[PDB]
Design a protein around this nucleic acid. Structure first.
Ligand code: PAR
Ligand code: PAR
Ligand code: K
Ligand code: K
Ligand code: K
Ligand code: K
Ligand code: K
Ligand code: MG
Ligand code: MG
Ligand code: MG
Ligand code: MG
Ligand code: MG
Ligand code: MG
Ligand code: MG
Ligand code: MG
Ligand code: MG
Ligand code: MG
Ligand code: MG
Ligand code: MG
Ligand code: MG
Ligand code: MG
Ligand code: MG
Ligand code: MG
Ligand code: MG
Ligand code: MG
Ligand code: MG
Ligand code: MG
Ligand code: MG
Ligand code: MG
Ligand code: MG
Ligand code: MG
Ligand code: MG
Ligand code: MG
Ligand code: MG
Ligand code: MG
Ligand code: MG
Ligand code: MG
Ligand code: MG
Ligand code: MG
Ligand code: MG
Ligand code: MG
Ligand code: MG
Ligand code: MG
Ligand code: MG
Ligand code: MG
Ligand code: MG
Ligand code: MG
Ligand code: MG
Ligand code: MG
Ligand code: MG
Ligand code: MG
Ligand code: MG
Ligand code: MG
Ligand code: MG
Ligand code: MG
Ligand code: MG
Ligand code: MG
Ligand code: MG
Ligand code: MG
Lengths: 73, 101, 117, 88
RNA sequence: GUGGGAGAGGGUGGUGGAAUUCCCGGAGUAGCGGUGAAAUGCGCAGAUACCGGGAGGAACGCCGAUGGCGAAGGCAGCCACCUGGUCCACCCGUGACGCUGAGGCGCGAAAGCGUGGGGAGCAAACCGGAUUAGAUACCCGGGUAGUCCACGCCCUAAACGAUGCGCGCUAGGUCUCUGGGUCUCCUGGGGGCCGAAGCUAACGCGUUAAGCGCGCCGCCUGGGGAGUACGGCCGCAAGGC
């Protein structure tokens, strides 16, 4: 049920449409390279919709990964 | 005539002369495709979240320009020719949409 | 006769068989084992016991090269995965890391009829 | 696309009086602009039928407006056509 | 008209990463594969697993949903260009210009047809291996068409809400998408669930009507024979109406 934390309230003022701002988009990806659902991000419909596309934009540029290996399993 | 943002990721191994040549070619190609440059951010060598062209780094450039829309995809075409340049991405500028404000 | 002493222990598990490939740090293999390397022939190769034996025979093959530390990399979902893990976990080899690198496509190819829907 | 300056140009060309944004002529003329631009879009991209829908709907509304004017004031109707160059 | 919003709506070009297969190199040995169990198959010309490089075809994981768009069919990596529909606020303009719609015309999943390309994976047919009393199957190993592309055909469907389109009237509660506003809340468009009155043979429907009304179209008239025969129109054919 994601009662650990929500990422939006773990963050201050930021621009959802910044594809080049890694040290924040990083915070929205999982331990794998995957994009977190609204359970974790706490975003809204429109917010998660746009953040998705700016993360994909960032992935093409080589700033965020497409996938990662899982550690410690 | 619209407002765009050119992202260029080129080889991180270039000494000052070759890179200066590439930047020259960027300015020139812009003048040929009618890009009035409003501002530019040079972020330089930067770690890549996956190797591009087998190189774990890449040199980053960003240009907020204004140019004829009808010649946008032509321009990007030209920018992709240089072997030194390994990523071209042109994007329509947008108003920043803020969260948690 | 290389004297590696440190490497990577790949585990390829599937619902039919479990196969261990032990490599140098660069990734080139040194020795290996599986369910068929041991006397198991039929479906028994897809056992967690068959896996255990395979990983132990792999670790013992690699002791002959004097290897001590390994990084484990699991690929494939299948029985005997975690049992091969636990076989190496105290096999004499020290497990420095466990990593699950099971390849997943991004909706790339059409599976067999067996795997559809 | 169609810039607001072109829009103003054609509106003001066809406005019955200054500030006329809604006359029959302004409507028919606007639709004529859009129709011609869409037809030029459809000489290329002839495999785009979903737009072609919008085209049939535009032609239909223009024909209803022209039939209306034809009924009410055939003078302004012929004048409109003679300016736009429609019916052939 | 003005000014803003939202969207996998459409076309074209470009482009990104994961995976499969194949080719090359490296390292390495007796098997891999597959099943209920097996076998065929593949492997000593060195496979499987493992690292590096390379080619090519297809499809876009997470986001993603009870979500959105579209007239329907249908639409999902990203960027740009061209282009359709819609929603809100403002009360600005036209002055009943409206609705429906036989015929017509256009669209129309898959499969299928013609030419030419392409062909990785999957796979009708087909070739094997099993199973069975048999097994023209379900299971396993292969594999052609096809699936993909351009262009032209075909025109069907459980083409489904099994519910034609438009407009007015008739308690609410709640979830959600997307606007506006004096932003506890008010107000508009869309998608859900429960339900007033009411309706229904019942099931159920119930401001997204299957309620109460008006307008126009399409259609039914017991089962089989039969979507057959004949005629006509269409089609390269399959066949469609
Ligand atoms: N249509 C393509 C899509 O456009 C998106 O953006 C679209 C919408 O957000 C935007 O809305 C526009 C805007 O001017 C404003 N919100 C109102 C306006 N009526 C809209 O324009 C609309 O109407 C015109 C015809 O009049 C159409 O040509 C156009 O496609 C349609 N969007 O217009 C854009 C073009 O349709 C995104 N770029 C992306 O999803 C995608 O490229
Ligand atoms: N390529 C992007 C898309 O191409 C579509 O059509 C394109 C493709 O269908 C067609 O084939 C292209 C071509 O480069 C060449 N013949 C081979 C190449 N592998 C294909 O490109 C694509 O093929 C398929 C889809 O068909 C994709 O799944 C794949 O990512 C990509 N390789 O070439 C067309 C362009 O020349 C449409 N234009 C539009 O959807 C979009 O621009
Ligand atoms: K093969
Ligand atoms: K699919
Ligand atoms: K839905
Ligand atoms: K609001
Ligand atoms: K029900
Ligand atoms: Mg280049
Ligand atoms: Mg097996
Ligand atoms: Mg209409
Ligand atoms: Mg789209
Ligand atoms: Mg080889
Ligand atoms: Mg043999
Ligand atoms: Mg030999
Ligand atoms: Mg042989
Ligand atoms: Mg292989
Ligand atoms: Mg490789
Ligand atoms: Mg080939
Ligand atoms: Mg899903
Ligand atoms: Mg609809
Ligand atoms: Mg709908
Ligand atoms: Mg459907
Ligand atoms: Mg008024
Ligand atoms: Mg008046
Ligand atoms: Mg109608
Ligand atoms: Mg008709
Ligand atoms: Mg069809
Ligand atoms: Mg087809
Ligand atoms: Mg064909
Ligand atoms: Mg062919
Ligand atoms: Mg051929
Ligand atoms: Mg062939
Ligand atoms: Mg096959
Ligand atoms: Mg088969
Ligand atoms: Mg057979
Ligand atoms: Mg029997
Ligand atoms: Mg053929
Ligand atoms: Mg359907
Ligand atoms: Mg249905
Ligand atoms: Mg419904
Ligand atoms: Mg519906
Ligand atoms: Mg209805
Ligand atoms: Mg219907
Ligand atoms: Mg209507
Ligand atoms: Mg509603
Ligand atoms: Mg819907
Ligand atoms: Mg109910
Ligand atoms: Mg009752
Ligand atoms: Mg009841
Ligand atoms: Mg009603
Ligand atoms: Mg009938
Ligand atoms: Mg009927
Ligand atoms: Mg009878
Ligand atoms: Mg009948
Ligand atoms: Mg029939
Ligand atoms: Mg006949
Ligand atoms: Mg004939
Ligand atoms: Mg037949
Ligand atoms: Mg016939």
């Amino acid at each position: 049920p994601s009662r650990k934390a929500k990422v939006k309230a773990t963050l201050g003022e930021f621009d959802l449409r910044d594809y080049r701002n890694v040290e924040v988009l990083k915070r929205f990806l999982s331990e794998t390279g995957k994009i977190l659902p609204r359970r974790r991000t706490g975003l809204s419909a429109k917010e998660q919709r746009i953040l998705a596309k700016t993360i994909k934009r960032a992935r093409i540029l080589g700033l965020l990964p497409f996938t990662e290996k899982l550690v410690r399993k | 005539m619209r407002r765009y943002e050119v992202n260029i990721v080129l080889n991180p191994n270039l000494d000052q002369s070759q890179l200066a040549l590439e930047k020259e070619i960027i300015q020139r190609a812009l003048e040929n495709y009618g890009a009035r440059v409003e501002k530019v951010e040079e972020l330089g060598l930067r770690r890549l979240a996956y190797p591009i062209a087998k190189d774990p780094q890449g040199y980053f450039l960003w240009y907020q320009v204004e140019m004829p829309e009808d010649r946008v995809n032509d321009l990007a075409r030209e920018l992709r020719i240089r072997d030194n340049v390994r990523r071209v991405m042109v994007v329509k500028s947008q108003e920043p949409f803020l969260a948690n404000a | 006769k290389r004297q590696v002493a440190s490497g990577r222990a790949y585990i390829h598990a599937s619902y039919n068989n479990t196969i261990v490939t032990i490599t140098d740090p660069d990734g080139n293999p040194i020795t290996w084992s599986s369910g068929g390397v041991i006397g198991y022939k039929g479906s028994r190769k897809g056992t967690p016991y068959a896996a255990q034996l395979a990983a132990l025979d792999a670790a013992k093959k690699a002791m002959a090269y004097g290897m001590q530390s390994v990084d484990v990399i699991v690929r494939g979902t299948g029985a005997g995965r975690e049992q091969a893990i636990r076989a190496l976990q105290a096999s004499g080899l020290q497990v420095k890391s466990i990593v699950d690198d099971t390849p997943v496509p991004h909706n790339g190819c059409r599976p067999k009829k067996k795997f559809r829907k | 696309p169609i810039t607001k300056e072109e829009k103003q140009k054609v509106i003001q060309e066809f406005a019955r009086f200054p500030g006329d944004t809604g006359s029959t002529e302004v409507q028919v003329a606007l639709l004529t602009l859009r129709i011609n631009r869409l037809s030029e879009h459809l000489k290329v991209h002839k495999k785009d039928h979903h737009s072609h829908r919008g085209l049939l709907m535009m032609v239909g509304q223009r024909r209803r407006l022209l039939r209306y004017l034809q009924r009410e004031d055939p003078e302004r109707y012929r004048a409109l056509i003679e300016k736009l160059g429609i019916r052939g």
